[PDB]
Amino acid sequence: TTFRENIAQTWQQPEHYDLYIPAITWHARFAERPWGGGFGLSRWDEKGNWHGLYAMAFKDSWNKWEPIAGYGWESTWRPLADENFHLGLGFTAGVTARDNWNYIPLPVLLPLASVGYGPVTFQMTYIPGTYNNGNVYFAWMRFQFLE
Ligand SMILES: CCCCCCCCCCCC[N+](C)(C)[O-]
Ligand SMILES: CCCCCCCCCCCC[N+](C)(C)[O-]
Ligand SMILES: CCCCCCCCCCCC[N+](C)(C)[O-]
């Protein structure tokens, strides 16, 4: 209900747009940047928490277009004298699709964490081993635009 309200508000009244550029991927516990990118809309809410709606493109194992689009949210902390430093933890609820399965929309739910300074943020997820080519951390820079 509040989740439905929140997504919409980002949809209807975004405050910024963002560019997402993949940065690094590594295997959880150690078991060129990754191809792709995305863009999105976002806002900081009155709790100072982050809401985003994004669309990204990657390349799958067959070198085929692999989209993901979704909503991201992070509970955000600004613990230092310079309020521009921000750390966050939340999740993303999204949809992806694969050439092998005729691009049928499939639900994805993943964790999110980030550390940034003002409009420049290192943000990441853990892709669980339940997914093909999973059990990896995947991180990107997010660049926030508009004042
Ligand atoms: C299902 C969620 C899809 C939401 C994706 C929204 C992305 C639109 C961002 C357009 C940004 C406009 N631009 C390029 C001038 O920044
Ligand atoms: C708020 C943005 C959330 C973006 C979540 C990205 C999840 C997909 C991770 C990329 C996977 C691409 N690849 C080729 C490694 O499978
Ligand atoms: C990207 C590196 C990992 C960052 C992990 C940061 C997690 C700190 C928790 C931030 C939220 C704090 N709190 C309780 C006010 O929400």
From Swiss-Prot:
Activity regulation statement: Inhibited by lauryldimethylamine oxide (LDAO) and dodecylphosphocholine (DPC).
Entry keyword Translocase: no
Effect of residue 131 to A: Does not cause significant structural perturbations of the enzyme, but induces a 2-fold increase in the palmitoyltransferase activity
GO cellular component: cell outer membrane
Effect recorded for residue 60 to N: Drastically reduces palmitoyltransferase activity while leaving expression and membrane insertion intact
Effect on the protein upon substituting residue 114 to A: Fully functional
Effect ascribed to mutating residue 72 to M: Mutants with longer amino-acid side chains at position 113 preferentially transfers laurate chain (12:0)
Gene Ontology molecular-function annotations: O-palmitoyltransferase activity
The protein's Enzyme Commission number: 2.3.1.251
Keyword Acyltransferase: yes
Reported induction: In magnesium-deficient conditions.
Subcellular location: Cell outer membrane
Reaction(s) this enzyme catalyzes, per UniProt: lipid A (E. coli) + a 1-hexadecanoyl-2-acyl-sn-glycero-3-phosphocholine = hepta-acyl lipid A (E. coli) + a 2-acyl-sn-glycero-3-phosphocholine; lipid IIA + a 1-hexadecanoyl-2-acyl-sn-glycero-3-phosphocholine = lipid IIB + a 2-acyl-sn-glycero-3-phosphocholine; lipid IVA (E. coli) + a 1-hexadecanoyl-2-acyl-sn-glycero-3-phosphocholine = lipid IVB (E. coli) + a 2-acyl-sn-glycero-3-phosphocholine
Keywords recorded for this protein, A-Z: Acyltransferase, Cell outer membrane, Membrane, Signal, Transferase
Mutagenesis or variant effect for residue 27 to N: Drastically reduces palmitoyltransferase activity while leaving expression and membrane insertion intact
Active site as annotated: 27, 60, 61
Site, Role in the phospholipid gating: residue positions: 131
Location (main, coarse): membrane
Any single biological process term in GO: lipid A biosynthetic process
Subunit structure: Homodimer.
Entry's family note: Belongs to the lipid A palmitoyltransferase family.
Summary of the function given for this chain in its UniProt record: Transfers a palmitate residue from the sn-1 position of a phospholipid to the N-linked hydroxymyristate on the proximal unit of lipid A or its precursors. Phosphatidylglycerol (PtdGro), phosphatidylethanolamine (PtdEtn), phosphatidylserine (PtdSer) and phosphatidic acid (Ptd-OH) are all effective acyl donors.
Note: Overproduction leads to camphor resistance and chromosome condensation.
Protein name per Swiss-Prot or TrEMBL: Lipid A palmitoyltransferase PagP
Organism: Escherichia coli (strain K12)
Gene name linked to the record: pagP
Covered residues, full protein: 32 to 186 of 186
